[PDB]
Amino acid sequence: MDVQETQKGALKEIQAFIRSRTSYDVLPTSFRLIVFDVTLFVKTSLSLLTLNNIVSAPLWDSEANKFAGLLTMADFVNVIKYYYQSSSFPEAIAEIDKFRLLGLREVERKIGAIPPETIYVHPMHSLMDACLAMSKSRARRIPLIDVDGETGSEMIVSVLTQYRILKFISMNCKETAMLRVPLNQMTIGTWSNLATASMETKVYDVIKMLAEKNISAVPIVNSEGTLLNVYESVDVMHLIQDGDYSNLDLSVGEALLKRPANFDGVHTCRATDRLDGIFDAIKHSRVHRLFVVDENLKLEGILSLADILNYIIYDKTTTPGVPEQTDNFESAV
Amino acid sequence: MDVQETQKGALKEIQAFIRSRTSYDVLPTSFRLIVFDVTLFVKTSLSLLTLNNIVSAPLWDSEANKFAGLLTMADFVNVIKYYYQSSSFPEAIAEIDKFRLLGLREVERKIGAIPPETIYVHPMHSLMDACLAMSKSRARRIPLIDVDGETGSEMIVSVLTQYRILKFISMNCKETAMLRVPLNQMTIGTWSNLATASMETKVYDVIKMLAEKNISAVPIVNSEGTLLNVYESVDVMHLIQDGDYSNLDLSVGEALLKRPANFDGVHTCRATDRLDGIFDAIKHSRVHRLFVVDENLKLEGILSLADILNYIIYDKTTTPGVPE
Amino acid sequence: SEQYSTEIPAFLTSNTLQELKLPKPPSLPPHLEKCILNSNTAYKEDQSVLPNPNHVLLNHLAAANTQLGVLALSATTRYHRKYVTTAMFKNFD
Amino acid sequence: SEQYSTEIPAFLTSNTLQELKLPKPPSLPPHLEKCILNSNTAYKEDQSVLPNPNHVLLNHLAAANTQLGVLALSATTRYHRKYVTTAMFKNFD
Amino acid sequence: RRNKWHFGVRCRGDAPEILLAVYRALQRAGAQFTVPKPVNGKYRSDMYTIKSRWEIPHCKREGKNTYAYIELQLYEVMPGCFMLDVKSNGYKDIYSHPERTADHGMDDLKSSFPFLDLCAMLVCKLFS
Amino acid sequence: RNKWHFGVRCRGDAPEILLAVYRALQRAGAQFTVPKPVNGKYRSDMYTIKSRWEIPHCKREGKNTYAYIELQLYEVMPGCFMLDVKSNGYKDIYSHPERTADHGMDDLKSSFPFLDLCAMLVCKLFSA
Numbered sequence A: 001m002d003v004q005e006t007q008k009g010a011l012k013e014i015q016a017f018i019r020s021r022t023s024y025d026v027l028p029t030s031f032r033l034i035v036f037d038v039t040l041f042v043k044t045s046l047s048l049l050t051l052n053n054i055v056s057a058p059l060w061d062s063e064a065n066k067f068a069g070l071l072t073m074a075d076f077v078n079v080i081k082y083y084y085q086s087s088s089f090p091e092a093i094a095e096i097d098k099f100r101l102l103g104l105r106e107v108e109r110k111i112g113a114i115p116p117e118t119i120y121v122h123p124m125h126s127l128m129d130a131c132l133a134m135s136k137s138r139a140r141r142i143p144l145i146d147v148d149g150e151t152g153s154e155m156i157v158s159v160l161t162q163y164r165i166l167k168f169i170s171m172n173c174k175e176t177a178m179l180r181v182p183l184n185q186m187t188i189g190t191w192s193n194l195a196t197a198s199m200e201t202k203v204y205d206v207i208k209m210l211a212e213k214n215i216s217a218v219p220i221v222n223s224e225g226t227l228l229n230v231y232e233s234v235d236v237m238h239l240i241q242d243g244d245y246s247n248l249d250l251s252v253g254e255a256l257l258k259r260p261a262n263f264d265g266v267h268t269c270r271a272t273d274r275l276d277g278i279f280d281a282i283k284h285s286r287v288h289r290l291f292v293v294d295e296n297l298k299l300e301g302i303l304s305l306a307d308i309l310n311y312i313i314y315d316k317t318t319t320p321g322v323p324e325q326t327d328n329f330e331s332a333v
Numbered sequence B: 001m002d003v004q005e006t007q008k009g010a011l012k013e014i015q016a017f018i019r020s021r022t023s024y025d026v027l028p029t030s031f032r033l034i035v036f037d038v039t040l041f042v043k044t045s046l047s048l049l050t051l052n053n054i055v056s057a058p059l060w061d062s063e064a065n066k067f068a069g070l071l072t073m074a075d076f077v078n079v080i081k082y083y084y085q086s087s088s089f090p091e092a093i094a095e096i097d098k099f100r101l102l103g104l105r106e107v108e109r110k111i112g113a114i115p116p117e118t119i120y121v122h123p124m125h126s127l128m129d130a131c132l133a134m135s136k137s138r139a140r141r142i143p144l145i146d147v148d149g150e151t152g153s154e155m156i157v158s159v160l161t162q163y164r165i166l167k168f169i170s171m172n173c174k175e176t177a178m179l180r181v182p183l184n185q186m187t188i189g190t191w192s193n194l195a196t197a198s199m200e201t202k203v204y205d206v207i208k209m210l211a212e213k214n215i216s217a218v219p220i221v222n223s224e225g226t227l228l229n230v231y232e233s234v235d236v237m238h239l240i241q242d243g244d245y246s247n248l249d250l251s252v253g254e255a256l257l258k259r260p261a262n263f264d265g266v267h268t269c270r271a272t273d274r275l276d277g278i279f280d281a282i283k284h285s286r287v288h289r290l291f292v293v294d295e296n297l298k299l300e301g302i303l304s305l306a307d308i309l310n311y312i313i314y315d316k317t318t319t320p321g322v323p324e
Numbered sequence C, D: 001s002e003q004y005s006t007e008i009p010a011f012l013t014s015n016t017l018q019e020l021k022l023p024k025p026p027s028l029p030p031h032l033e034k035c036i037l038n039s040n041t042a043y044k045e046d047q048s049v050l051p052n053p054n055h056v057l058l059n060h061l062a063a064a065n066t067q068l069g070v071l072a073l074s075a076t077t078r079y080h081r082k083y084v085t086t087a088m089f090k091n092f093d
Numbered sequence E: 001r002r003n004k005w006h007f008g009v010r011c012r013g014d015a016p017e018i019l020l021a022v023y024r025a026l027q028r029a030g031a032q033f034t035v036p037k038p039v040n041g042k043y044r045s046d047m048y049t050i051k052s053r054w055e056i057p058h059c060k061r062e063g064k065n066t067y068a069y070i071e072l073q074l075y076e077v078m079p080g081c082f083m084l085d086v087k088s089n090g091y092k093d094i095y096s097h098p099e100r101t102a103d104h105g106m107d108d109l110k111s112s113f114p115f116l117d118l119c120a121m122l123v124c125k126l127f128s
Numbered sequence F: 001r002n003k004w005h006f007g008v009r010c011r012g013d014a015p016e017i018l019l020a021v022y023r024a025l026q027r028a029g030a031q032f033t034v035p036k037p038v039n040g041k042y043r044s045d046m047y048t049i050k051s052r053w054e055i056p057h058c059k060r061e062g063k064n065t066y067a068y069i070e071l072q073l074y075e076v077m078p079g080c081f082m083l084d085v086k087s088n089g090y091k092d093i094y095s096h097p098e099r100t101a102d103h104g105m106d107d108l109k110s111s112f113p114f115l116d117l118c119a120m121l122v123c124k125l126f127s128a
């Protein structure tokens, strides 16, 4: 059959697989889950995060014994930007440190950046429920919670990321090898209105881009558009770790000098590449997104994990369903 | 006129010079004074002392606009020590970090480790009066304080150290040269009932010596009484800044490994040395105390700046200078 | 069990120790001693991944110093057939 | 000429931006470009010692970021014929 | 700053005085507990096994009365040094009859919460 | 490139910074000079604010005493500014010598309460 149709058959099969599994099937046999009291200070939060080499944690409300939402880099980024654009004194920004996590969230609700409330799925419910929830919330992660009837307490089992789900699929679906349709004949990814930055762009300006487009990274290009590097929201956390907010005044170039070694690298592919190579890349390295570039590393687009996962779960003749509900939100870096 | 009667005469001159000068005369023409709000957390205080390379700071009470006491390592030493004795749970100690400087003074007050009033002099009183007042308590340091008639705000001009005072004397009194009486015919310094420790001693155990004798340092000896090192109350500060109180459990040897390359060193002298040479050491370098040893480095005694200062101000023979 | 009460046992308070004999509590078993959170950095870059736990030790409290003024408290429990070691960071009071 | 008031000048409210940018502020003169606390002249003895300040900067506020959530504020004053730069570390709020 | 986890809470000194401090912490926390019983007017090591019961404040404050069952054990690590080992044995509401007399486990789910929250309240008490 | 600097840093538009300084002085409780237009138009001296503050520790004890604080916006580089804050000293308004002139005049020594009032300004500024 033709290449297009083979892909469509492959995708039906992965959908079936995704539906058959549970979120719980993605989990390792023995694993760790780090939880934060909502009443922690921010500055304490950044240290624990950095210290544990994680970029996220679910929040726990301990008077209630309820899950209290999910902490991600998007929280800091949105709050930092909100204070930054309305203050005329740079150092005032350092006050964010003295907020409790509960408060930080209140600020996001008052500026309309976090939804009404909490979103999650049962760990023993279909893995596709988790994908659809993430799709409708524009979240990159979703907590697996189960409510205990004896106590009313909600049991946080874990947090599921689109990286881990995609990696789970690449390891259990030989049918990824049958996705050979190239990207340029596909409508997947973002090819216009790209937030980009230069080496001379100040970090506070990247932060604003991060928040405004609600994205997690910003490619760095020179004039004439070649790809040089990337500035992640996580790199921002590291800069402001240990209370040093003047680092936001640094240029991107200056900030990269302060960024640790990253093996793996920055993943690039061409418009003629296809989902199959992307899956083999997913199984042996932590791809957070692929930057689409030409002959001469000229940036033409971005394909991120959400773009791949939303495309996959949306079915016959590619829905269009999909992605629907409150499509900006806090969720979930 | 004989070494004895000569020292007798030099002291008289030194004493005359010290009254004659004000504390103010001791100050450099341009100087820094670092001040701490009394409501600062213990946690922030230790960090601040650590990065400004200082070991104490006057406290400011900023509702009243009043000096509020002097923060020194004795404050932490006393409360750690209290805490170590009375709790069955080791990791409770770390709660000290969340005390404010005020409640730290409050704790020290209950257990009575602290005087009531905030010891001081006017910057223009006689230098002798500041020496007397330091000697009258322990202090080690005395704040030079004035008030502003316009506002009733206390003005902390500076804080004066027995070291600075002794160096001032050193730099301005040639008569320090004429104190040739050997330490062994004087009664100055402590020469028995010493608080010592060895490399195996747990740091928490040194901490209780420091509080119980309230002293700033404990020499480290071996079984033969040979001087190996010292362990200072400022070492303890370094142990616990950044808030890792499990270091107190370290022995002295392992704790020593964490001493920054920055260390002044340990000054020694001999029982046959005397004040002329010690003033000369003080003139040209930072001496906190001297450990008196023999030829095999066997510890014999401890001569600290307060002992020197006390001999200097109180007659040749009024106090522990009585002597032979 | 079934005895739940107040207050502190009479002995222990007032007063006249030395003891009766009062015995020494049991020695520390070796199956305590090791905690699975202790494997530093953690492997293949999952990192959340742990060794399977010792069963006898499900739901025993575990603790560590933070240097940041918060409690660090953990406990491994079983979910369906998999194991969750949740580590919580909490303010005091 | 009527000195003090408690009202926010009205014109500074609402319509604002007309490039009739109500004058620019003066440029920073060279003497405010450097604070004598920055020149931790260390010697090896006296660490409180400082260069003699500039007379026209007596009683001017100076500040430093602390990375510790407290204000660090200082000012240099004359005591008799000598100079005191006091650096205060203070809680916010 | 990421160091070593260890079971229980570290304690030191005199085992009875430790046991005396644990009992007081429980009562300040408002917990209910077993007390020791003598084999004549003489005691057995079992003295260092308490097992307490805790009204669950977020249940109380709601429409229920559910208890958490927490068992404490003092081990000696080295003379002068002890571990206070704390173990969850589940949760039980109001005659929810399936079932377990061993504290109904918290139904079939066996969550670390509210256990660890109460562990928190214990540690504060033992530290204050 | 060195941690201490004169004044308080600001960025943006100088008129907006000026409006911020004023709101802050207003909410800290101080009084101040106001700009006066010279024949239709405002001038650069608008960035010079003389302020006056009732000293709180003095007020608490039934004393009417003022601190005189002079504020001055300078531009360091395009869009970056220093709010220079200066002490003109203090005055218990009921004494000197017996009512001949005013405005600080006499004392010029201590940096307190000045530094404590600066801490109030900076708090207000940082929490607009």
Ligand SMILES: Nc1ncnc2c1ncn2[C@@H]1O[C@H](COP(=O)(O)O)[C@@H](O)[C@H]1O
Pocket: A140, A189, A190, A192, A193, A194, A195, A196, A213, A214, A215, A216, A217, A218, A219, A288, A289, A302, A303, A304, A305, A306, A307
């Ligand atoms: N720098 C960017 N500029 C414009 N759109 C982007 C950029 N980065 C990501 N996106 C799109 O925004 C969505 C989520 O981004 P990410 O933060 O990478 O998960 C995806 O659909 C991306 O294709």
Ligand SMILES: Nc1ncnc2c1ncn2[C@@H]1O[C@H](COP(=O)(O)O)[C@@H](O)[C@H]1O
Pocket: B140, B189, B190, B193, B194, B195, B196, B213, B214, B215, B216, B217, B218, B219, B288, B289, B302, B303, B304, B305, B306, B307
């Ligand atoms: N380790 C020590 N053992 C006994 N006495 C000491 C010791 N260190 C200092 N002293 C005495 O206590 C006083 C104050 O000591 P310092 O803390 O060195 O100023 C002086 O008179 C010392 O001689």
